Amino acid sequence: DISGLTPCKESKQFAKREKQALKKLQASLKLYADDSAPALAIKATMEKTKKRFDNYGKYGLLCGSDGLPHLIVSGDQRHWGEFITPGILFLYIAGWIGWVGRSYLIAIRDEKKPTQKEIIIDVPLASRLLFRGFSWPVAAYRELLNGELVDAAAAAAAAAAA
Amino acid sequence: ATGFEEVGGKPWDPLSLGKLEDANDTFPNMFPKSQYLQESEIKHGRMSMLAWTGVWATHVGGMGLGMHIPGMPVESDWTKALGVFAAEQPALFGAILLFISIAEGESVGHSGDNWRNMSTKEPGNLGFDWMGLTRKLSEEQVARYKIVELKNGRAAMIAMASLFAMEAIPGSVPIMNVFN
Amino acid sequence: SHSVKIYDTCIGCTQCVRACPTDVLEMIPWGGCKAKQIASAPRTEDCVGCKRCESACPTDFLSVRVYLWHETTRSMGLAY
Amino acid sequence: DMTWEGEYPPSKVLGPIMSKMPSGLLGLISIACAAVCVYSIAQSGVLQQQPGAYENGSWVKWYYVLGSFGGPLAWGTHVASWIQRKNGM
Amino acid sequence: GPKRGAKVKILRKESYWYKGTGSVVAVDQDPNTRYPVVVRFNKVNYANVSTNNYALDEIQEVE
Amino acid sequence: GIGHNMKEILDAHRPPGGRLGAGHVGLFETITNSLHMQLGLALAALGVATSLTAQHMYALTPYAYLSKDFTTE
Amino acid sequence: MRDLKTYLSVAPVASTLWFAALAGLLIEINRLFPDALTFPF
Numbered sequence: 031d032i033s034g035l036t037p038c039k040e041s042k043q044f045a046k047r048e049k050q051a052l053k054k055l056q057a058s059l060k061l062y063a064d065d066s067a068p069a070l071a072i073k074a075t076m077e078k079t080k081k082r083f084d085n086y087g088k089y090g091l092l093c094g095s096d097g098l099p100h101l102i103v104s105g106d107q108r109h110w111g112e113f114i115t116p117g118i119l120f121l122y123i124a125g126w127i128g129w130v131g132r133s134y135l136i137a138i139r140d141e142k143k144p145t146q147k148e149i150i151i152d153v154p155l156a157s158r159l160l161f162r163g164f165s166w167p168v169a170a171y172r173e174l175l176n177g178e179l180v181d182a183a184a185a186a187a188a189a190a191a192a
Numbered sequence: 193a194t195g196f197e198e199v200g201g202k203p204w205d206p207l208s209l210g211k212l213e214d215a216n217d218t219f220p221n222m223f224p225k226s227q228y229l230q231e232s233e234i235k236h237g238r239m240s241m242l243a244w245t246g247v248w249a250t251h252v253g254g255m256g257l258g259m260h261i262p263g264m265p266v267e268s269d270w271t272k273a274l275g276v277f278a279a280e281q282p283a284l285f286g287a288i289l290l291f292i293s294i295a296e297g298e299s300v301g302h303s304g305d306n307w308r309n310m311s312t313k314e315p316g317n318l319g320f321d322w323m324g325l326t327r328k329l330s331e332e333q334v335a336r337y338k339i340v341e342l343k344n345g346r347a348a349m350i351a352m353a354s355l356f357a358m359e360a361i362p363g364s365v366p367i368m369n370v371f372n
Numbered sequence: 373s374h375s376v377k378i379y380d381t382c383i384g385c386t387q388c389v390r391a392c393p394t395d396v397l398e399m400i401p402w403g404g405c406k407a408k409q410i411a412s413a414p415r416t417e418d419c420v421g422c423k424r425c426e427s428a429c430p431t432d433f434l435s436v437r438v439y440l441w442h443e444t445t446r447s448m449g450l451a452y
Numbered sequence: 453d454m455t456w457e458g459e460y461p462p463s464k465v466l467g468p469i470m471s472k473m474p475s476g477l478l479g480l481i482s483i484a485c486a487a488v489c490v491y492s493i494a495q496s497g498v499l500q501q502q503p504g505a506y507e508n509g510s511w512v513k514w515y516y517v518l519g520s521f522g523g524p525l526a527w528g529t530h531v532a533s534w535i536q537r538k539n540g541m
Numbered sequence: 542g543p544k545r546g547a548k549v550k551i552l553r554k555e556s557y558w559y560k561g562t563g564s565v566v567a568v569d570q571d572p573n574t575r576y577p578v579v580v581r582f583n584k585v586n587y588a589n590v591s592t593n594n595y596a597l598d599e600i601q602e603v604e
Numbered sequence: 605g606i607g608h609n610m611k612e613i614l615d616a617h618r619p620p621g622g623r624l625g626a627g628h629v630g631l632f633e634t635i636t637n638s639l640h641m642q643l644g645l646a647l648a649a650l651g652v653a654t655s656l657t658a659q660h661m662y663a664l665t666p667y668a669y670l671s672k673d674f675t676t677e
Numbered sequence: 678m679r680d681l682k683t684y685l686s687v688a689p690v691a692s693t694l695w696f697a698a699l700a701g702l703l704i705e706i707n708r709l710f711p712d713a714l715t716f717p718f
């Protein structure tokens with residue numbers, strides 16, 4: 031496949047990693063009696079470990095000669111779950127914070143003491159604003175084609191140079 | 193008669209794409225002026241009216257047309273029909289491409305900047321009124337056939353988008369799964 | 373020695389003269405501002421260059437200004 | 453003297469020979485240059501493909517190389533023609 | 542020119558508040574003063590100073 | 605007689621779109637009347653060049669037996 | 678107790694409560710849906 035990689039369910043070296051990770055925890059398990067808390071903890075760890083290899087095998091990830099999963103970010107839609115889909119997710123949450131935080135500064139600006147409300151949050155007002163950023167791509171778009179997103183060039187102070 | 197009969201008699205610009213380039217001072221001439229957007233819409237419409245009729249007239253069987261110029265290559269689908277014709281008929285393909293290249297270059301060579309409202313021509317006005325039409329018709333008809341050309345351009349652009357989507361997404365337009 | 377220049381935006385509030393640790397500046401009569409007095413730099417050769425005068429000037433930008441100059445024994449601040 | 457204002461540059465930028473010339477001649481010349489460049493390139497490619505003509509760099513010919521050099525000339529001439537047309541020439 | 546209470550924009554380039562807005566407080570009527578206009582601001586500069594004197598050709602009026 | 609004038613080249617390059625402002629008018633005087641700009645352009649090209657020689661030498665070894673003496677490479 | 682409420686609205690107290698709620702948000706999701714390298718789950 032891409033870059034001469036093989037899928038992880040068919041990699042001979044990915045399977046060896048699964049065995050040696052389980053063998054290491056089994057040889058630690060043998061020094062304890064079967065009902066005790068260290069034996070139940072290591073038994074639960076080998077279940078977590080065994081479920082970690084099974085998950086990847088059917089995942090659809092690509093392995094190398096090293097036996098480790100690789101990620102593809104060319105833009106292929108077949109490997110979307112690797113970068114695109116968690117990427118769109120992060121953009122939604124990061125742009126949500128920046129939008130909401132900016133709404134707050136603009137709101138408390140027209141006031142006697144704007145600086146007072148940055149060290150001591152008006153929580154009822156802040157709480158209201160935080161959840162209005164769920165539709166930010168629409169709200170950031172309405173202000174771009176209004177004139178309320180970016181200011182004019184005669185409103186920004188500039189260094190003597192330019 | 194107005195061009196807006198299907199959207200309520202008002203200019204359909206949701207997403208305000210004509211107002212951009214004027215909303216802010218921040219990209220100086222990086223979005224197209226009204227004159228350039230008006231020629232793009234006329235040109236995309238005219239290429240779509242020809243291309244839909246092309247894929248409709250060469251489709252064999254089904255509803256289809258199966259009409260075929262004698263001597264040209266028999267090709268079933270429109271998706272590969274260009275590259276077969278480009279390899280087999282170099283002289284005919286090169287003369288069509290040169291004709292398109294000159295006429296499309298002449299469109300802008302005599303007039304000013306289009307991207308900026310500095311063109312001095314009406315958008316869509318290529319010197320092809322050979323029939324002498326609009327010199328014999330009156331102003332109500334001439335303004336009317338412009339809107340006729342526009343909406344038929346607009347129906348064909350959506351058609352060409354359907355024709356693209358059915359081959360990239362196999363269940364996209366369902367009225368063509370049946371129609372073939 | 374160092375160079376100390378005084379611009380016309382001087383409002384004459386005597387704060388540079390009170391801050392100078394080596395008696396370089398003084399206040400003189402002037403008829404261009406409310407206080408009718410401007411700072412002057414008559415003894416720039418005692419100037420050590422510590423810029424305390426500019427930390428005291430209230431105008432924006434400063435009315436008093438110190439520029440680095442050739443160093444003598446006096447501006448080096450030596451006691452030997 | 454070279455600096456210009458407005459939509460199009462003055463005729464003097466083209467040079468002494470070019471400014472005198474009419475737009476039509478320049479456009480025709482540019483088209484001819486373009487034809488020569490493409491044909492020459494195609495011929496060179498055919499020679500490269502051909503057996504017994506490509507050995508030891510035999511495919512390279514002086515005339516084809518001249519046409520290849522001529523592609524840039526075709527672009528410049530067309531630009532000059534546009535400028536001439538703009539200056540009402 | 543401005544009056545008392547007018548909102549102006551600073552046109553001095555080396556000022557901290559170039560292209561920035563603020564409020565006229567006192568205009569010295571005596572024209573021997575070179576910078577007759579006290580203009581106050583709500584944000585401080587790097588020396589934590591809140592006001593400055595200006596000439597009439599260095600301030601613009603907003604509305 | 606034949607040939608270009610550098611100043612006449614630079615003054616004519618202002619795209620009519622107006623995006624680059626006045627274009628390159630005045631650059632001819634600023635380069636000739638200043639050695640620090642000349643020195644800065646010369647140092648930038650040599651720094652790209654000696655960096656380019658470091659990458660091409662290890663990949664396309666030009667000298668007989670290079671890339672054998674591991675230390676020298 | 679309107680002064681304790683203004684004390685609970687000061688920036689460092691709100692920052693630690695917000696972070697405590699948000700670290701524990703991520704810890705809880707990593708407790709039920711662990712080892713999610715990607716969407717494959």
Ligand code: CLA
Pocket residue numbers: 199202203204205209210229230232233236346347349350353356357
């Ligand atoms: C590329 C083609 C194109 C272009 C340049 C224009 C240009 C214009 N149209 Mg127009 N239009 C088009 C196609 C186009 N139209 C189609 C197909 C329809 C039918 C739905 C219409 C219906 C229409 C109406 C009813 C009106 C306009 C109006 C306008 C004008 C202002 C709006 C504007 O600036 O948007 C142009 C800006 C763009 C960025 C165009 C690109 C569109 C983006 C990229 C979305 C495309 C997504 C696409 C569907 C995905 C493909 C599907 C599939 C393959 C995945 C302007 C002259 C208004 C007008 O005349 O006001 C006076 C008006 O009211 N148009």
Ligand code: CLA
Pocket residue numbers: 123126127130159160161164695699
């Ligand atoms: C460390 C990583 C990290 C992560 C993962 C997050 C994650 C999040 N932050 Mg945080 N944050 C962080 C660090 C982080 N933050 C840091 C370092 C700071 C600086 C101090 C902040 C500052 C901060 C602020 C101020 C805010 C956030 C908020 C948010 C949330 C925005 C998205 C959301 O509310 O849910 C997604 C919600 C949806 C997708 C709902 C969709 C919209 C509804 C209408 C659809 C309804 C669908 C329906 C219910 C479905 C049921 C149907 C049924 C049939 C199934 C999100 C949980 C915001 C928040 O908490 O929200 C109130 C918020 O205001 N963050």
Ligand code: CLA
Pocket residue numbers: 278279282283284286287289290293483485486487489490491493494497523526527
């Ligand atoms: C738009 C003009 C145009 C273009 C682009 C071409 C291009 C081509 N023709 Mg063609 N042709 C044309 C007009 C044109 N022709 C006309 C008007 C006729 C007469 C009716 C012919 C008759 C003709 C015959 C009889 C044959 C070709 C062949 C070819 C191919 C050359 C061989 C090859 O592999 O390419 C070599 C590579 C190139 C040409 C690319 C070089 C491009 C460089 C970067 C320079 C740019 C070109 C130029 C300066 C710009 C043109 C300006 C123009 C718009 C005014 C090539 C695809 C031959 C072929 O192999 O058939 C497939 C062949 O047998 N043509």
Ligand code: CLA
Pocket residue numbers: 293294296297298300301302530531532533534535537
């Ligand atoms: C950057 C190169 C370049 C430049 C500056 C020009 C300039 C011009 N061309 Mg020309 N042209 C070019 C390439 C170029 N052409 C190419 C590649 C072809 C195809 C072979 C043509 C074919 C052509 C025709 C047929 C005609 C012109 C005409 C004209 C003139 C005005 C009308 C016009 O621009 O519409 C033409 C618009 C285009 C060709 C758009 C394509 C532009 C190129 C391909 C984009 C690449 C630019 C890119 C940003 C550069 C990046 C820099 C670097 C990274 C390489 C003008 C002098 C007309 C004329 O003679 O004046 C009356 C005319 O009729 N051109």
Ligand SMILES: CCCCCCCCCCCCCCCC(=O)OC[C@H](COP(=O)(O)OC[C@@H](O)CO)OC(=O)CCCCCCCCCCCCCCC
Pocket residue numbers: 305459619620621622623
């Ligand atoms: C990118 C960083 C590189 C390092 C910096 C070096 C400087 C490089 C910048 C110079 C070029 C700037 C070009 C932009 C600014 C710019 O070009 O504006 C100006 C430029 C030409 O305008 P002029 O000022 O020359 O005006 C000429 C007209 O007035 C006609 O007379 O516009 C163009 O059309 C350029 C050529 C094609 C431009 C578009 C075609 C290219 C297609 C690219 C595909 C787009 C992606 C679409 C995705 C869907």
Ligand SMILES: CC(=O)O[C@H]1CC(C)(C)C(=C=C/C(C)=C/C=C/C(C)=C/C=C/C=C(C)/C=C/C=C(\C)C(=O)C[C@@]23O[C@]2(C)C[C@@H](O)CC3(C)C)[C@](C)(O)C1
Pocket residue numbers: 242245295318319320
């Ligand atoms: C479906 C089907 O099968 O159909 C067939 C046939 C069909 C439609 C024909 C086909 C085609 C080929 C096409 C479309 C070819 C198009 C060719 C084209 C578009 C050629 C323009 C030339 C412009 C010129 C010379 C302009 C001169 C302009 C002149 C001379 C002027 O001076 C104009 C002037 O204006 C001013 C400035 C001011 C006015 O006051 C005065 C006048 C008016 C004098 C297809 C694609 O094959 C399909």
Ligand SMILES: CC(=O)O[C@H]1CC(C)(C)C(=C=C/C(C)=C/C=C/C(C)=C/C=C/C=C(C)/C=C/C=C(\C)C(=O)C[C@@]23O[C@]2(C)C[C@@H](O)CC3(C)C)[C@](C)(O)C1
Pocket residue numbers: 294297475476477478479480482483486517519520521522523524526527528530533534
């Ligand atoms: C009498 C009258 O009115 O006539 C009318 C006729 C007509 C048609 C109506 C008119 C028109 C329009 C015209 C003439 C339009 C012309 C357009 C034209 C001719 C556009 C060329 C572009 C060339 C390019 C981009 C070259 C690139 C060349 C490149 C990128 C190269 O690097 C070449 C090269 O790399 C090779 C390939 C390899 C090497 O071996 C050599 C080198 C390295 C250097 C006019 C103007 O109205 C006048």
Ligand SMILES: CC1=C(/C=C/C(C)=C/C=C/C(C)=C/C=C/C=C(C)/C=C/C=C(C)/C=C/C2=C(C)CCCC2(C)C)C(C)(C)CCC1
Pocket residue numbers: 641644645648652
């Ligand atoms: C500050 C200053 C200065 C300086 C500057 C500098 C130092 C700069 C640098 C710069 C740089 C350092 C640059 C670089 C660049 C580079 C480039 C731009 C590249 C290019 C490339 C290309 C374009 C392409 C390529 C290619 C080819 C050719 C083919 C093959 C492939 C490829 C595609 C890769 C001066 C002196 C002016 C003065 C004033 C101030």
Ligand code: SF4
Pocket residue numbers: 376391392393394395396397418419420421422423424425426438
């Ligand atoms: S630089 Fe120091 S010593 Fe000199 S005048 Fe200013 S405050 Fe006084």
Ligand code: SF4
Pocket residue numbers: 381382383384385386387388389410411428429430431435436
């Ligand atoms: S220079 Fe500064 S400290 Fe000295 S008198 Fe003027 S305003 Fe006062």
